[PDB]
């Protein structure tokens, strides 16, 4: 055992699996949950010897051996994050250790709130498509809601209801929201009621960095994010925090750092920090701004094509990487569409429409442009992506007429021969279209 | 821009640093914190398109598109994990999503306890340096004790205080303890006081797989671990739990605590790397490696005993040895610093008789160097270099008063820095010649 023998030679079972995922990403239309195709350079650092370094604690104050290079990476990653978001290092700091998105938010909560302190966040922030929570368990949550008429945040009810609830922390964030969040309005409500504003910009950070949308940094105390959504890097988290005066100084740095370690996490994933750091250098470039504009252009193109075929869209359209389809008028629910699209190699997830209760089978569907725009899709290509989605939906409506239960519907897609061929036909064309485009990452895996 | 260009071309600055870490890993003696060197096959899964795959939820119940392949990698990793610890699928399940060890443990607390329920773990379970823990913040913790004279865990005193305190959960686990933990005895206590036994085998779990030390699964009903210490995999975490039988109710709650309570999407690249490594862990080869880790610890202990270093608890049954430097007249602060400057990695440790006192100890481990085909004679050779480091430490501790002055002296003094550079070069020669698991250059 050398320890240096390839994956394909030493573990065929797993290499066979790895290749199926690479083929699927290449052959399919990837529209799911603001995901992306990570670059080769970032991935190289992600699966590297940096995986082997213990480095509990923080750069500067690690006195045990070996953490000297890893210090310089962590400190580099910070500067590049502050650069990507055009932040004054005197006014802003950043903690690059959080293992993913949720651990980033959890570390902010435990840093600034006592157990049982009160938090407010948007109800069903990610769509509610998987029907307690950290927020709800160790602290006292109260949701604010979307306004069912407009599909936008009901900032009024949020302002009115927060005066009564008295939260110490309000979250400004939603991964299933196709419009721009009014951070200044959220800052009003927080200052009045005497609360921290946390901008969770998980799925839109690359857009914020490229300056194709308004920055929550101009208004938020704290900003959390992910690094694998619209930022195009590795799966990781970040926590940005203000520092300096306003002379009463901010006290975020030490509490936020102490919450990540030692309160919640162990030693950081230095492989992940380096892969993030690669992607953030990439994000600073003009190439990434031109990409981010194309993301918006493509999502708007997608939105228009759906509208032009008589689809309803939650909130009328988009200012965003996302477009939320409301399928209820068209006659299909989200679970049904979600499934049918999988079988023709199109990844989406269902989404709860504003107005509908928990027990209604979500009638919407969340789509997003980041992944495919990274494969050099233009507006024409997304217009043609919608042709494929619409055809898939029309198969669904045919099968809805011939079936009753969700389980009847689902079996009928596989077993009815006239349906399984129409799906196979749409799958073959979808796949003929998608393969032709380039793909970021490695050739083979 | 393709996103397909090499790291060295598109980011020379980062590539430089990456190779400095790889170089430092090859030329150094690496004894810190039970860390290891990950297989190339494992790191190839880690550097992969699996990074791109969203899959919040669990296999079989993920109805959004794209998850078909990742459903299989997750379930395969579970079977490969239950296989590696010789666990029957009817009696044991395993959750392979924890982002690391501390999330793996935190998920178990929230799964089983309410907030403010009572817990008991070992005081300073990791050691010294770097209401503190999240376990202290949300729950009501009262620590249990090492016996300050012997070095071992005070099982009698633990049972005394546990009768008073009425804990709901007890944590068996220390990443700074050179001994076997009497899991039978801890279950006897937890049965008596009606409490859950959690076994955090984080640092030792590779040894448990290879059957070279006794298994906590015999006596515990929840087991957490890491996958990058003795298991040699990528950085991650696991939660093993009972199922079957009057049935167990751990599966649903544990799963809910991981998602949606504490985590978002799983890291499927890391899960896939773990799965590569648990396959490696099921082989006779891995058992050779693990026996050699235990024997290289003893070989390291005995060479330190043979120069009259006191070791906490007399020695080791383990992958690591805990060196008491209070007799020798140096502290863990100065020791780890000198060793760092001659490419030897270790960390300071609190000795049983003392907290706010500079830790007069040292934690050294086999796993990493044993993975470079180090034998007993190579570890006695390691102790030679460590001993020369300690000696230089005493040489400087005489000449200088405070740590700020001490550390400055190691760089600024001409005669010391040359004797350092000389020792360093003899360590870097010795180590560079050994083989290294992983990629050639990064």
Report how this structure was experimentally obtained: X-ray
User: Taken in order A291, A94, A47, A203, is the CA torsion positive or negative?
Assistant: negative
CA B215 – CA B121 distance, rounded (Å): 19
Name the CA dihedral angle for B322, B328, B333, B336, rounded to a multiple of 10 degrees: -60
Instruction: With beta carbons under 8 A apart, name residues in chain B contacting A9.
Output: 41
Minimal Cα distance from B268: which residue of A? A235
Chain A residues with CB under 8 Å of B33 CB are 54, 56, 64, 267
3-state SS string over chain B? CCCCCCHHHHCHHHHHHHHHHHHHHHHCEECCCCCCCCCHHHHHHHCCHHHHCCCCCCCCCCCCCCCHHHHHHHHHHHHHHHHHCCCCCCCEEEECCCCCHHHHHHHHHHHHCCCCCEEECECCCCCCCCCCCHHHHHCEECCECECCCCCCECHHHHHHHHHHHCCCEEEECCCCCCCCCCHHHHHHHHHHCCCEEEEECCCCHHHHHCCCCCCHHHCCCEEEEECCCCCCCCCCEEEEEECCCCCCCCHHHHHHHHHHHHCCCCCHHHHHHHHHHHHHHCCHHHHHHHHHHHHHHHHHHHHHHCCCCEEHHHCCCCCEEEEECCCCCCCHHHHHHHHHCCCEECECCCCCCCCCCCCCEEEEECHHHHCCCCCHHHHHHHHHHHHHHHHHHHHHHHHCCCHHHHHHHHHHCHHHHHHHHHHHHHHHHHHHCCCCCCCCCC
Verify cis geometry, omega within 30 degrees of 0, for the bond prior to B260: yes
Calpha distance A54→A76 (Å, rounded): 18
A·B CB contacts under 8 A = 349
Please judge whether A265 and B22 are an interchain contact, meaning their C-beta atoms are less than 8 angstroms apart. Answer: no
Cα separation of A77 and A84, whole Å?
10
Q: Which two tokens stand for residue A25?
A: 């990403």
In whole angstroms, what is the distance from residue A411 CA to residue A404 CA?
11
Q: Is there a contact between B99 and A99 if contact means CB atoms under 8 Å apart?
A: yes
Q: Which tokens sit at B137? A: 């913040």
Distance from CA of A409 to the nearest CA of B (A): 14
> Which residue on chain A is closest to B30 by alpha carbon?
A66
Residue among B22, B23, B44, B56 flagged as catalytic: B56
Catalytic residue among B54, B161, B185, B387: B54
Closest CB to B37: pick one of A52, A63, A441. A52
CA end-to-end distance (rounded Å), chain B: 24
Domains and CATH numbers, chain B: 39-282 (3.40.640.10), 283-442 (3.90.1150.10)
For residues B246 and A421, give the distance between their C-alpha atoms in angstroms, rounded to a whole number. 48
Q: Residue A360 has which token pair?
A: 């209604």
User: Three-class SS of residue A196?
Assistant: strand
From chain B, pick out residues whose CB is under 8 angstroms from the CB of A232: 3
Decide if B56 is catalytic: yes
Exactly one of A62, A187, A229, A350 is catalytic; which is it?
A: A229
Among A17, A53, A99, select the one facing B73 at the smallest CB separation. A17
**How far separated are the first and last CA of chain A, in Å rounded?**
23
Main-chain phi, psi angles of B118, to 5 degrees = -95, 140
What is the dihedral sign for C-alpha B37, B39, B45, B48?
positive
B99·A101 Cβ contact <8 A: no
Distance between A90 CA and the closest CA of chain B, angstroms: 24
Q: Give B-chain residues touching A100 at CB under 8 angstroms.
A: 99, 263-265, 267
Q: State the CB neighbour count (10 A cutoff) for residue B283.
A: 13
A34 within 8 A of A203, measured Cβ to Cβ: yes
Q: Tokens 């360590």 — which residue?
A: B427
Beta strands in A115-217 (DSSP E): 118-120, 140-141, 169-172, 196-200
Cβ atoms of residues B338 and B397 within 8 Å? no
Single out the catalytic residue among B235, B328, B337, B348. Answer: B235
8 A C-beta contact, residue A101 and residue B264: yes
The DSSP code for A395 is H
Strand order in the sheet with A169-172: A92-95, A237-242, A222-226, A196-200, A169-172, A118-120, A140-141
Please compute Rg for chain A using Cα positions.
23
Using an 8 Å CB-CB cutoff, list chain B residues near A62: 130
Sign of CA dihedral B393, B395, B399, B401: positive
Q: How many CA atoms lie within 13 A of B349 on its CB side?
A: 28
C-alpha dihedral, A217 to A111 to B96 to B90, nearest 10° = -140
Q: C-alpha distances in angstroms, A415 versus A333, A396, B427?
A: 21, 14, 68
Instruction: Give just the sign of the alpha carbon dihedral B380, A63, A98, A232.
Output: negative
A229 is an active site residue: yes
The pair phi, psi for residue A58, each rounded to 5°, is -130, 150
């Amino acid at each position: 055992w050398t320890g240096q023998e390839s994956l394909s030679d030493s573990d065929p079972e797993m290499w066979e699996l790895l290749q199926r995922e690479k083929d699927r990403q290449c052959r399919g239309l990837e529209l799911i949950a603001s995901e992306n195709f990570c670059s080769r350079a970032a991935l190289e650092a992600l699966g590297s010897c940096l995986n082997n370094r213990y480095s509990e604690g923080y750069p500067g104050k690690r006195y045990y051996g070996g953490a000297e290079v890893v210090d310089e990476i962590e400190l580099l990653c910070q500067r590049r994050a502050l650069e990507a978001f055009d932040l004054d290092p005197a006014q802003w700091g950043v903690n690059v250790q959080p293992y993913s998105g949720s651990p980033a938010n959890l570390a902010v909560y435990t840093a600034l709130l006592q157990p049982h302190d009160r938090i407010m966040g948007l109800d069903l922030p990610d769509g509610g498509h998987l029907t307690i929570s950290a927020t709800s368990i160790f602290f006292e949550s109260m949701p604010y809601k979307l306004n069912p008429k407009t599909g936008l945040i009901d900032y009024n009810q949020l302002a009115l209801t927060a005066r009564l609830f008295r939260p110490r922390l309000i979250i400004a964030g939603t991964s299933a929201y196709a419009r721009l969040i009014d951070y200044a309005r959220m800052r009003e409500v927080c200052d009045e009621v005497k609360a921290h504003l946390l901008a969770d910009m998980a799925h839109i950070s690359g857009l914020v960095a490229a300056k194709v949308i308004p920055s929550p940094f101009k208004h938020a105390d704290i900003v959390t994010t992910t690094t694998h959504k619209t930022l195009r890097g590795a799966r990781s988290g970040l926590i940005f925090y203000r520092k300096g005066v306003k002379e009463i100084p901010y006290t975020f740095e030490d509490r936020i750092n102490f919450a990540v370690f030692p309160s919640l996490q162990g030693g950081p994933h230095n492989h992940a920090i380096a892969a993030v750091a690669v992607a953030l250098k990439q994000a600073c470039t003009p190439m990434f701004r031109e990409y981010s504009l194309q993301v918006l252009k493509n999502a708007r193109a997608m939105a228009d094509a759906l509208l032009e075929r008589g689809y309803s869209l939650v909130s009328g359209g988009t200012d965003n990487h996302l477009v939320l389809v409301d399928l209820r008028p068209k006659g299909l629910d989200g679970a049904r569409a979600e499934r049918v699209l999988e079988l023709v190699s199109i990844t989406a997830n269902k989404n709860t429409c504003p107005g509908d209760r928990s027990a209604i089978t979500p009638g919407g569907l969340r789509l997003g442009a980041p992944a495919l725009t990274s494969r050099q899709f233009r507006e024409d290509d997304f217009r043609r992506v919608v042709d494929f989605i619409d055809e898939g939906v029309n198969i669904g409506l045919e099968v809805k007429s011939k079936t009753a239960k969700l389980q009847d519907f689902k079996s009928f897609l596989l077993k009815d021969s006239e349906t399984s061929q129409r799906l196979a036909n749409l799958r073959q064309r979808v796949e003929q279209f998608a393969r032709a485009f380039p793909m970021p990452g490695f050739d083979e895996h």
